[PDB]
Symmetry: D3
Subunit: 306 residues, 6 copies
Amino acid sequence: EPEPQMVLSPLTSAAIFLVVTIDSGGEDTVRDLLSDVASLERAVGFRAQPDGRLSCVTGIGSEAWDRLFSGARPAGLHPFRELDGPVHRAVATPGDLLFHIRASRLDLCFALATEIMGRLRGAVTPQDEVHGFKYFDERDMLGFVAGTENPTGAAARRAVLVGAEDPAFAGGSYAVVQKYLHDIDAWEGLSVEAQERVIGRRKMTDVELSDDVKPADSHVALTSVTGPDGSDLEILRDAMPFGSVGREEFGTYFIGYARTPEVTETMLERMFLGTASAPHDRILDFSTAVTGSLFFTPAADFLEDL
Amino acid sequence: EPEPQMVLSPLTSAAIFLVVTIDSGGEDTVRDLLSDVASLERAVGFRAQPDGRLSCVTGIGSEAWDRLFSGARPAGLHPFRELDGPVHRAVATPGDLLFHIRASRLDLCFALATEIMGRLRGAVTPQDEVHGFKYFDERDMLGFVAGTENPTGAAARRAVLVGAEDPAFAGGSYAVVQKYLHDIDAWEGLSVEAQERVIGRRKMTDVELSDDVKPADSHVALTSVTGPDGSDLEILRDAMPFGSVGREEFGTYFIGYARTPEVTETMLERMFLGTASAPHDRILDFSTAVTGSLFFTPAADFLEDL
Amino acid sequence: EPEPQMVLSPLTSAAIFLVVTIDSGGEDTVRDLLSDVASLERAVGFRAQPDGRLSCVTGIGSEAWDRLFSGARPAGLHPFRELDGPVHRAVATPGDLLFHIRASRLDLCFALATEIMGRLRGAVTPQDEVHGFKYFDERDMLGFVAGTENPTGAAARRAVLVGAEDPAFAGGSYAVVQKYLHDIDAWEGLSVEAQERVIGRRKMTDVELSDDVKPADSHVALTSVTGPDGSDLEILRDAMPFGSVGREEFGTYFIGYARTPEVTETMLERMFLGTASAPHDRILDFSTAVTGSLFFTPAADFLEDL
Amino acid sequence: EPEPQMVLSPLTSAAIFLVVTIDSGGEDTVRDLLSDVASLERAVGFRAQPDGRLSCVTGIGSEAWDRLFSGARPAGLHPFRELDGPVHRAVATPGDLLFHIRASRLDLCFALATEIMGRLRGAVTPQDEVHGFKYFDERDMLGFVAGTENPTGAAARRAVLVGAEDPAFAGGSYAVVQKYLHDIDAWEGLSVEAQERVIGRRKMTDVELSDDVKPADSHVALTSVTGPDGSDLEILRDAMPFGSVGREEFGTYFIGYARTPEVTETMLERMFLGTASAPHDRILDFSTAVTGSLFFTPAADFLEDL
Amino acid sequence: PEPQMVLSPLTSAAIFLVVTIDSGGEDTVRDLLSDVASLERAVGFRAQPDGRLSCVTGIGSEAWDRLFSGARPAGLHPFRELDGPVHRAVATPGDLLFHIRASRLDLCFALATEIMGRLRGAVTPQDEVHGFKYFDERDMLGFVAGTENPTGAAARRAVLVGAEDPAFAGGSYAVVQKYLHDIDAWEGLSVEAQERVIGRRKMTDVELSDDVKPADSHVALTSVTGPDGSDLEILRDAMPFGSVGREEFGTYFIGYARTPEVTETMLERMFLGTASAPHDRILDFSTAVTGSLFFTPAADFLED
Amino acid sequence: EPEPQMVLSPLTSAAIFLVVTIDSGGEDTVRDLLSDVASLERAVGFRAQPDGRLSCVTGIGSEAWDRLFSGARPAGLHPFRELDGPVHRAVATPGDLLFHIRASRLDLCFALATEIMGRLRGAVTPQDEVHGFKYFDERDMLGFVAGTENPTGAAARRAVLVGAEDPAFAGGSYAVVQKYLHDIDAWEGLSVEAQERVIGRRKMTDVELSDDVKPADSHVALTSVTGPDGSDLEILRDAMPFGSVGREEFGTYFIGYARTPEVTETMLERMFLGTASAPHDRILDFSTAVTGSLFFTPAADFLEDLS
Ligand code: HEM
Ligand code: HEM
Ligand code: HEM
Ligand code: HEM
Ligand SMILES: [Mg+2]
């Protein structure tokens, strides 16, 4: 088999997301760092095992792919598509390389980002840096448990990893990132029961609302999607709270992994464009997207053989 | 028996430092929050015990003291004094209120900061916000172990807490804060042995250099101070690394606690102004101060009664 | 000078409460066990240290005291007083001996209870046995954080331990126990905001309601009491959830420790008999008392002396 | 593949065993709960991961199966078979549904039991509820280590999961439960060496007795069984201590999982009816069975597609 | 005065180092003594809070007179040999003791390495033992070890020199003996017979009742009452050690007390017996091959 | 397919290495103990789960194999080959049985060793006994992080376990042991930068030196080897510090596992005999080998199905 990157990670309480663009002439410096990134992860993380749980997933954008590599393109790799809905917009922002860094502690994420950015100085321009923290009981910036219905084990592997549909790229995945800022004032003005109707779960106990009470425009209803077979279409998410209390900046950095970008893009269309029964996802009345990018995260042996 | 604030804390791997100025007319809102800050600490932290280890130490500046309170001033409270050395300068920057927030996780620091700044909205202007992280083996941004020679137990209590010398304020302490930015490139250009001559301890094993090889201008030599009786004068320090890899900002946020600011100010004079044997602390050839402020952290019962 | 029992314990996730009456002729068997109870605690607990945190607090009722001992009575020892309110009743039930057994695991509590009851077979009749468990985020059976405003450190010692006011019994405490069963159907019919008006704290974040919106008949308002000097009167509580899902028994086992029973009894009078502004504690509309007893927990050296 | 339920769980120190009958007319409410039980397990357990280790195994009895489902039946599903031995009896008691709930803390077990029974109120009658706790060194109520010779990994999967011998029910297992009470007075009247001859292993070190000293009527000799091919026949056991010190109730709740009930029933016949060499298992001279039931635990996809 | 870390948290690992001071080694020794506390902080700090590293430094009677002028601690004298009818407590040489404890052997070894590095060419090693506790606090005989140690203020009153010897307040006396066990003979006894040797139940660690506890059980003989009828207590941290290949199965005994009189009265009852007991039955399965006595000064004494 | 022994273990901070020779006539006692070693592991270890992480890997030497078992030999089992280099020697020392015992605590390793040796008394003679401890940040006796480039997961299983190339022994592995003593005085006389040119990685941060600076005779350059297709050949290491401060004994006990002894023996030839670019591994100028032995660690089912 090919060795995937650590897409399927254990639960982690800390993350750094780095998005960067490749300057004129930066290609060779980038290809060098890509062939070393797995060995840098071992160097920073190994001495802190078993508690550190440090990992890095590397993604490459559509335009960056053609600057870096000759030969085939992964069949689903394209630039993020903007959605201009009746009320809400999903923007596209620039990005060539993503580093999704996770661990039990921010300091280990920081030490790996420092070695990666040290090797790229003068080849890349930073577009975004986010220092994520999960709340001690797995809660998100809105006060709800985050991750409950993610797939696990073999269902997670089937949902996330490219297979025989695109054999040269088996063991890869597609990552969509969006930085959201929340209107926390408007959100905390709702009763808990009104917040539960926005999400589609109980806030304190995390039990799903039944199909007879769950509104059509609740976040859980709109991100539930069935294929032609009537099989559930799933993705793997690891969204992280972030912010600054001084600047009144309270955010969710969304990341979702899927075997094909079509599943994530169908969920975004239902959220932003609505359906027959729902104008839009109620969660977008409290959350504004300010970034949007799409990346292919190759199998680790692809990056190693550079 | 006055109750000190949690100046003497267990080791913590995460911190938020908040420094704000009090807007004109903000006095009443500030005095209200001060009388509730201990109950806010309990509310956010209690449900995360015993691993959270959340605490908040609240400091008040010299000029803020006069706007907030009638009656006595603590004997040692004055504005931070600028040091204009031949090569290096310790700047004085504005601050009325300090919140030193510590825990095992950044998310807990953030939830308490969020409730404090919620209560002060419209009454204060943010001057500094720093999210600190300690490395997993107690190392700082320069790669050295940080905290080793801090006093513990009764020696710590005698070094840090105001007593019979100023009985109205017994159980208070004085805090000095300074934000440093490092020249990491210049630092990593030194051999380990040359780094050890700058600090005055072995890098890997944390053993102090013997008095016959320790340079007079090493950091440990200059911050070792004896009183008139020939006793060691100690302070309690809890400096944290911080940074942004995107902006190439690699920093140490210094905080020192002492029973009287004279001990901390004598250390700063030796570091910046030098002695007969040393022009300046060699650590300042790799570290620039961009803030400097001084605060009195009163006994907890003082804040509770106002 | 006297050694208190482990009244001030570290947080524990498991407990057993054993209340027994002394059969006629049981006196000598009981006095023998009381002089050995500390050595049994060490025998069961030592091999699980330091994580086990096994402790047993032993209490003696007013009528039992007179059967067991000649000489002085603790000044405040009397039988629990029944409270006959217009709507709610605090019943008095028999109890000669209390064993308050706490640890990080149920199995350790059970092994010490097994040795204690082994020594007392044929000298005592069991009146109550409760196996308590804490929820993983310090929540009680109603879904609220329990323990938040307990006193700590020196304020805990001052609030709980008998001193110079009763010198022969210094290092003792008084314990009040009540078993409550909840109407969980009626409780879960309230909105979260209506539950918050019953307790007097926010449910998810545990922040106290501000003094102008906290109802006078909320639980927190009625159990806040000021002495003549204007000081807060405090007790130390370690209440535990318990239950059987099959019998629909959802309960709180209340225990409160105080230096004098007057403080605990003033809180119970406000809850059950009301004030000018509150007919009764709203928590009693969802909580029925089915036991009530009062015990003196002597200094450890008092039990050893026998 | 079919997905099995969590029959092969990690070690857990807490359990709840719930056995109910289905009331007349209750069928529809039960089939609803069965299709939701996995979603309830994720909802209660997710926020405690990865330490919580919460899992629920659902079993259905022979008579209940015929009330709930039409069509083909698991080949081995029948009501528990009573064993009337010369001295000892294995009773059959009523049970239609089993919930085997396991976690690292009792409170997590209790919260999932509460949500299961909340959905079944008015459709089922409780027959048995046991709160199990393991001793801190894996010991049982007799003072011996319990679980040592359980199969692990692939040998465990082969021992427990239905395969090609019953292809419509692949991924299922058969569970036998028995609640035992011990005569602890009679037991503790044996020497350690006499206790070792009852079990067939050393008490302090858990080393199996040599084939030259292991008695024919020791527990390990009688539950050791070889098939016609000379392979070991294994089951997976997760027996838990339970009891009440006040009632002098000291028990073991036995559960055994096997791919066919023939293996568990051959072990029970040797224990209760004896063999050529042994009248009965000596463990039954200190252990009385007061319940006995048999359940089929289907693959998880069976329960989901209801 | 600040005591050394005599009263430590429970630890699962220890190194015991006993050395003699070579002629001319005195100055090198006095230099290392004034730095041992800063070496403990250096090695241990970065491994907090799990490390639990401490070093207790002791000085023998003969070594005291070579190192220091002025007062002697009142109770400091050479370990006394006990020539009993059946069992012997030997006296073996020892000038300096380092009792190193932590959660992990590697931390003990790193501190030992820095101490012995500073003393190279000034000292000769007499004994080095790497100790390990079993996961349920059991010792080499299979019994729970440490159960009756005093705690808190009763421990401080039992262990630390006070007003009776004010120049040395905050010090303690340490007695060490290395024991080797006859494990074959021991495992030949029934559990019940082992319980009569110790005076405690093996599985549950409950003390035997006063009507069944033999007079020559280990717990009966090491129970000693003062004139007022109070228990005289010591603090013990004995550790298992061994080599499986050389069939060496041992207990390294260390006991701390405010005066050596308490520890020496217990050793006289064990080895010489009384009217009621020939000797401690534990000595029929345990041979002492070292014996030494040290004063562990207050930490401020080592600093000055 | 079959059950391997616990060759691929979780990280462990404590280990006991026991090497013994089988006395004449000891064969039957040895074969008895081999069929019980897995049940002895369960007995001592189960009650300490989940923290104990106790395991035992049992190895059999080439000459012991012939005395114990009458059928086929594993294809690669032979006595350790001595390497007589210009400067440095890798000696071959006697050993018939290896017990590689690992856990989170030394006491658990010691209790299993005690039960194993109890069953073997009078049938075997002890040749080596080492009580190993790892430093709290995975560092070795030289102060460098040890284990960093070990393979993990499926790459580890492919590197270590016998498969279709030798089907009767599938799920087995080959273990090489060497006890090294260090010259710590000579080592601590080097600058940190000079230590880094000996190893080939940075001491504080464990980052590999660039291909532009990494010397030909650094330890990392010489133990990197590519097969004919240009794939890396890998082994799995679990080397442990050991010592006695009194005797000035500071050591590393090396153990390496591989699917074929040819990978480990090629690395040892480059270290001790050198190449075109390097006379010898610079690590050997501060490390002397005092033992060397080779063992086959069979599949667990092989030990169990015995007599
Ligand atoms: C804008 C900020 C967002 C927040 C705060 C948020 C929050 C949540 C929460 C609380 C849940 C329920 C617990 C869980 O299953 O994790 C959830 C579920 C989910 N979210 Fe989001 N979400 C956000 C954005 C998105 C986006 C952008 C997507 C996909 C494009 C998405 C897809 C999902 C999916 C697929 C589920 C699982 C649905 C199910 O139960 O089947 N979410 N989210
Ligand atoms: C660049 C900013 C700073 C860095 C990176 C730094 C770093 C360190 C380090 C690595 C040590 C040795 C380990 C320890 O005992 O903590 C130390 C010691 C110390 N530092 Fe700093 N320091 C900084 C600024 C300051 C300032 C501004 C002062 C005082 C005004 C100070 C006071 C001390 C003192 C008192 C010691 C203890 C020395 C002793 O008695 O051994 N440091 N510092
Ligand atoms: C081979 C050497 C030794 C072994 C294996 C050993 C073992 C034990 C054990 C298992 C206990 C009972 C539980 C507890 O720790 O309280 C005990 C108690 C004790 N031992 Fe020892 N011991 C040894 C040597 C010594 C020596 C030489 C002394 C005194 C000089 C001593 C003094 C004590 C004392 C005072 C107690 C507590 C007595 C009490 O219950 O008041 N031990 N020992
Ligand atoms: C004194 C003995 C030794 C010491 C102190 C030592 C130390 C080291 C160190 C510190 C590393 C780097 C980090 C890592 O991957 O672990 C390493 C790597 C390595 N050592 Fe050793 N080692 C020793 C002996 C040996 C021997 C005898 C072999 C093989 C016969 C060996 C094979 C390796 C290999 C294959 C690597 C990984 C290199 C790579 O591909 O990056 N070592 N060793
Ligand atoms: Mg009975």
